[PDB]
């Protein structure tokens, strides 16, 4: 046991300052199975301002224990299908102890409710947004309260303290962070690392409104993204919840689920083309001297892929969560809370009426999460388990039959504690006698059966320091390994066994903690049951013949009654290699199924291990289950903190992947600063318009200087035409009253490309606004979204008019005889907006008579003339500077 630091007394003395200035982590409260209701809590120091809690049995009356009376709460599981939450009952106005602790929150909720006049019931619920489901909620922390915005990632420690005669729900937001090719915890620095709730009444409404808004918003996000990949959103909406239990792919959400699965396929098929290339790269990296030549290409492919992950996995995950949450809320709204929280798990039910889970697996689940309470009688059972006696049990029962009777749940909590202790003692005595003492001979049996590659795995790596250490790690490890092998072959297997070795040599380093906390959450993750198909029982010979029958890569677990070997085949290149993997020994491979069967028979029956693993049927010719794992889906199950199992299952260190996920979110946040800064979006539209102004003025000047003309002649932009291919002519008018117009052979494209540029904006103004009696009405009012780009085009047109004026008044100040093009542009804009000019062919005699009568100043149409329009387009835009910028527009408006 770790010694612990007397700083516990500082923490007791000023818990708020301590939690503000030091990171209080909770990891040992996750990897401890079924904590007591009541126990001793202590800190242990690990680094600079970094402390970990632990449960311990030592008395607080040896103050050198650095420990205090506190109430623990067990960790609840991560499967959204869970009806049985973790809860414990604690007094209002406590005397016995003044703190309450729980396992680190990652995708769950802590909900405090008032059970009666004198006691709170605190629930650790593994579902997101759980505070909506309970009733009489007075305090709560939901996933959203500690989520990092714009990401799926989140991590926070939550605990309760009795201070100033009331309970306070204390939330300490954290993250994992990279620090020189290592990981550490730290307080989150981008927001206030601590926040506090006293007991309140309105919390339900305050959450529910936010959830409704957030769900609407995420549905907008998904509609957007689906549109970006051309998927039809037609008819996608919530089916009214009609009947039945919670399920994934329930008809009510089926449209959303399908849309997610498909949009995911549109990127998964895309990335697979680079995935293959990356594998080719690693296969050449392993086999060549000049590693650093190609390694950077590995880095660039990683960056490319992780961009796509960061950009879309978060969206798909959040859509799944908001859909599961809305489903559960409908189930509550129709069937009442008693359908959505259950007091105990003994009313056995699930996604199917039975799921035939091995006793081993259902026990490990029953001993790596807390569901319901654990009264002090259970702790007394455990502390006294050598004295206690249990009916119908004796020392010569197998560990399996004890595990079964314990999962009968009929015994008292003190009896279940005693039987659990006896189970762990017998289990580890048997694992020692059967496997640790004989890890040697297995290597040689597999060798001289003819194996072609092997990697032993650390005997010592345990996912929990307590309970049966031996058998709990098997079910997640086989699910990780089969992904490793299917996705990366011998290099994957090497990287993963290296990871296990390091994580067992340094059992308290940050990475080994994150790995332990990321193999857990594979015990009962319903996505893995989505990635499964329990085929029948088979005799070993039949299993071998089935492997011989497979085409393409395929994998199988054996999931024997108390253990999980793995077996499978790869066929991609180098012939067909057949693999075998026993988590107690190592992974082995073979070139031919005869050799494979000759080895696996010797191993499982020749040394009777099939009987120690409790296989079915006769001792000879044992029968196993098998489960045709779909590595296409199993790889993508979430293990919290946004990691897919593939991510813990890769060639590089975890601090590399997390580093990359930092850097590419720096890059994406910088890019997002560029994509939606509407100030630069409009200022560049202004700069573009002014640049077209200078281009058109330069072109007009050149044309008016190759020919002979003066300031009285205006180019009529509305009439430029192509005089056949490749060559242009332009009409000019004497702006005075006379009819005098002259056509100039022009040969310059800008006299039509400027008209194209300006008619694009004028079609916006003609679409968003109407000109009435010489003022412009925003269509549908200012309250529509139209002004937000109608005025954005208007600011550009107005800045072009005021460009030409400020150039004319620059020439007049330093010269003479500017052509005064602002009148030409005003008469174009007027006639186009009033639709007197329009696209397509117009009679030149008509459009010229229009331009002429506009230049003569009298009203053409709309009971208005072009200078009134040119005023109204300044007025509306100067009002609209409020919408576009908020006013206070230095350098422009306050003349």
């Amino acid at each position: 046991p770790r010694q612990g630091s007397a700083d516990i007394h500082q923490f007791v003395t000023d818990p708020v300052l301590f939690a503000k200035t030091h990171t209080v982590s909770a990891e040992a409260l996750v990897r401890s199975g079924r904590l007591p209701a009541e126990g001793s809590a202590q800190l242990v120091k690990v680094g600079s301002g970094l402390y970990e809690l632990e449960y311990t049995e030592q008395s607080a009356n040896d103050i050198s224990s650095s420990s205090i009376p506190a109430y623990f709460l067990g960790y609840n599981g991560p499967n959204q299908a869970n009806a049985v939450p973790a809860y414990v009952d604690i007094p209002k106005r406590t005397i016995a102890g003044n703190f309450l602790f729980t396992g680190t929150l990652s995708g769950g909720s802590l909900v405090v409710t008032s059970l009666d006049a004198n006691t709170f019931r605190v629930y650790h619920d593994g579902r997101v947004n759980s505070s909506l489901l309970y009733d009489n909620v007075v305090m709560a922390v939901d996933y959203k309260d500690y989520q990092i915005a714009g990401t799926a990632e989140g991590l926070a420690a939550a605990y309760m303290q009795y201070v100033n005669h009331e309970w306070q729900l204390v939330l300490q937001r954290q993250e994992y962070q990279r620090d020189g090719q290592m990981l550490r915890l730290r307080l989150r620095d981008d927001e206030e690392p601590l926040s506090i709730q006293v007991a309140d009444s309105q919390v339900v409404e305050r959450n529910q409104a936010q959830f409704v808004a957030y769900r609407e918003q995420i549905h907008q996000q998904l509609k957007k993204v689906a549109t970006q990949f051309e998927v039809s959103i037609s008819g996608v909406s919530d089916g009214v919840y009609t009947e039945g239990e919670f399920s994934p792919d329930h008809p009510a959400i089926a449209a959303w689920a399908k849309l997610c699965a498909e949009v995911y396929d549109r990127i998964n098929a895309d990335t697979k083309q680079l995935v293959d290339k990356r594998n080719k790269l690693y296969e050449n990296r392993r086999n060549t001297i000049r590693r650093d030549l190609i390694n950077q290409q590995i880095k660039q492919l990683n960056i490319t892929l992780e961009y796509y992950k960061a950009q879309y996995d978060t969206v798909l995950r959040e859509a799944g969560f908001v859909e599961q949450s809305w489903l559960w809320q409908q189930i509550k709204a129709k069937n009442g809370s008693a359908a959505v929280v259950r007091i105990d798990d003994t009313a056995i039910q699930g996604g199917g009426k039975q799921r035939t889970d091995s006793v081993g697996e259902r026990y490990a689940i029953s001993e790596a999460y807390q569901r319901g309470a654990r009264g002090t009688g259970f702790s007394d059972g455990l502390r006294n388990f050598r004295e206690i006696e249990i009916p119908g049990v004796d020392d010569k029962m197998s560990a399996l039959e004890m595990k079964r009777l314990f999962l009968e749940g009929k015994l008292t909590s003190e009896q279940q504690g005693a039987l659990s202790g006896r189970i762990t003692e017998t289990s580890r005595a048997e694992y020692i006698d059967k496997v640790l003492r004989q890890t040697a001979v297995f290597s040689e049996d597999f060798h001289d059966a003819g194996s072609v590659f092997d990697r032993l795995v650390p005997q010592d790596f345990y996912l929990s320091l307590v309970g049966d250490r031996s058998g709990g790690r098997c079910y997640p490890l086989v699910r990780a390994m089969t992904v490793a092998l299917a996705s990366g072959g011998e290099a994957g297997i090497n990287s993963l066994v290296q990871k296990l070795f390091f994580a067992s040599a340094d059992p308290q380093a940050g990475s080994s903690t994150l790995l332990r906390n990321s193999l857990i959450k594979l015990h009962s993750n319903v996505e893995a049951v989505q990635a499964s198909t329990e085929l029948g029982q088979f005799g070993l010979s039949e299993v071998v013949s089935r492997l011989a029958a497979t085409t393409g890569t395929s994998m199988f677990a054996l999931n024997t009654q108390n253990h999980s070997m793995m077996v499978g085949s790869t066929v991609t290149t180098e012939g067909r290699r057949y693999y075998f993997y026993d988590p107690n020994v190592g992974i082995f491979a073979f070139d031919n199924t005869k050799s494979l069967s000759r080895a696996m028979e010797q191993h499982l029956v020749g040394r009777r291990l099939a009987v120690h693993y409790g296989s079915f049927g006769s001792k000879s010719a044992p029968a196993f289950n098998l489960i045709e794992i779909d590595t296409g889906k199993m790889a993508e199950v979430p293990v919290g903190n946004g990691l897919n199992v593939a991510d813990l299952t890769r060639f590089e260190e975890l601090s590399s992947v997390i580093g990359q996920r930092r850097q590419v979110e720096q890059v994406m946040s910088a890019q997002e600063r560029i994509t939606e800064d509407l100030q630069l979006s409009t200022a560049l539209q202004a700069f573009d318009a002014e640049q077209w102004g200078a281009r058109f003025e330069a072109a007009s000047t050149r044309l008016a200087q190759e020919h002979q003309l003066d300031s009285r002649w205006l180019p009529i932009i509305a009439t430029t035409e192509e005089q056949g291919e490749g060559r242009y002519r332009v009409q000019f008018i004497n702006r005075d009253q006379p009819e005098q117009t002259r056509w100039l052979d022009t040969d310059d494209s800008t006299f039509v490309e400027f008209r194209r540029f300006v008619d694009e904006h004028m079609s916006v103004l003609n679409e968003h606004f109407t000109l009435e009696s010489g003022r412009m009405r925003p269509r549908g009012g200012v309250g529509e979204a139209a002004p937000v780009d109608g005025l954005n085009a208007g600011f550009a047109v107005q800045a072009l008019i005021q460009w030409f004026s400020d150039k004319n008044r620059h020439d007049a100040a330093n010269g003479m005889a500017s052509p005064d093009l602002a009148t030409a542009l005003k008469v174009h804009s007027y006639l186009n907006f009033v639709q007197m000019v329009h696209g397509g062919v117009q009679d030149v005699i008509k459009v010229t008579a229009l331009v002429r009568t506009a230049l003569r100043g009298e009203v053409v149409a709309a009971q208005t003339s072009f200078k009134e329009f040119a005023l109204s387009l300044g007025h509306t835009v100067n009002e609209g500077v409020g919408v576009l910028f908020g006013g206070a527009m230095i350098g422009l408006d306050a003349y």
Binding site: A670, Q671, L680, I890, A894
Partner: protein, 272 residues
């Protein structure tokens, strides 16, 4: 436009929102002995923020409503439509642009000076629009209300020159050029070290993104319609300090399957 007998000059817009704009030669002589207090007082009586102008016949000046100090141009002629773009940062004074000279003035704390003859200078909101001098050596300016600058260059052998300090200050630097060729050997000097820059693209813009800062450099038309010009500029960075062609970068982007969408470090492409 309304002048009050006290000399304060107001605009009323078509909706009646009276706005203070200036104070005349009389108001400034009456207040003069406590003019800064009188200005802060009148900027309190009217809910106004930004800048106020001390109008006059032969001398004119600017009061920054957000600050204590006041900037007087001296004897430089009126009717130039003289622009105030904002208070400077990192050095004293403020910057003033004369649209009619096409010359930029630094109005010091105790005087004024011509800084350069930039053919245009403008501010829109938080963004400068800044355009080439007669001399072509274009480097941005430090200003307090702004975070973004657009650069444009048309002059002989014209060069863009980004200080490390400016790159550390401006969140965004935008660079733009017009079709008629200004020079082939058109250089961007980056004082920032190349290794931390990350290339990518918008639908048309190229982007060079820093990662120890949020500071993006954008090149406004490397892809899409104008790409076929193949006329594009060349970049100089501190480091190995080879000169890279924006053609070479778009070829690097086209090399991998990143031609779909992409991101990569410069130390790869420069050493490719």
């Amino acid at each position: 436009r309304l002048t009050t007998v006290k000399g304060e000059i107001l605009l009323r817009t078509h909706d009646g929102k009276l706005q203070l704009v200036a104070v005349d030669k009389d108001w400034q002589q009456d207040n003069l002995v406590r003019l800064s207090q009188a200005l802060a007082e009148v900027a309190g009586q009217w809910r106004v923020k930004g800048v106020l102008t001390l109008q006059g016949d032969d001398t004119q000046g600017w009061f920054d409503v957000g600050s204590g100090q006041v900037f007087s141009i001296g004897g430089i002629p009126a009717t130039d439509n003289l622009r105030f773009i904002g208070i400077a940062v990192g050095k004293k004074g403020a910057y003033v642009y004369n649209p009619t000279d096409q010359m930029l003035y630094q109005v010091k704390e105790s005087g004024a000076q011509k800084l350069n003859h930039y053919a245009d200078v403008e501010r829109i909101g938080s963004s400068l629009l800044l355009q080439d001098g007669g001399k072509g050596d274009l480097s941005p300016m430090l200003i307090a209300g702004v975070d973004s600058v657009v650069l444009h260059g048309g002059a002989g052998s014209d060069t863009y020159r980004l200080s490390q300090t400016m790159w550390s200050y401006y969140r965004t630097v935008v660079i733009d050029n017009d079709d008629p060729n200004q020079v082939l050997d058109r250089l961007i000097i980056l004082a920032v070290d190349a290794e931390k820059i990350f290339v990518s693209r918008h639908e048309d813009d190229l982007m060079l993104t820093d990662s120890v800062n949020g500071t993006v450099l954008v090149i406004r038309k490397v892809f899409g319609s104008q790409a076929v010009t193949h006329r594009h500029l060349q970049i100089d960075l501190e480091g190995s300090s080879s000169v890279i062609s924006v053609d070479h970068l778009v070829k690097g982007f086209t090399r991998l399957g990143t031609a779909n969408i992409g991101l990569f470090e410069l130390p790869w492409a420069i050493e490719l």
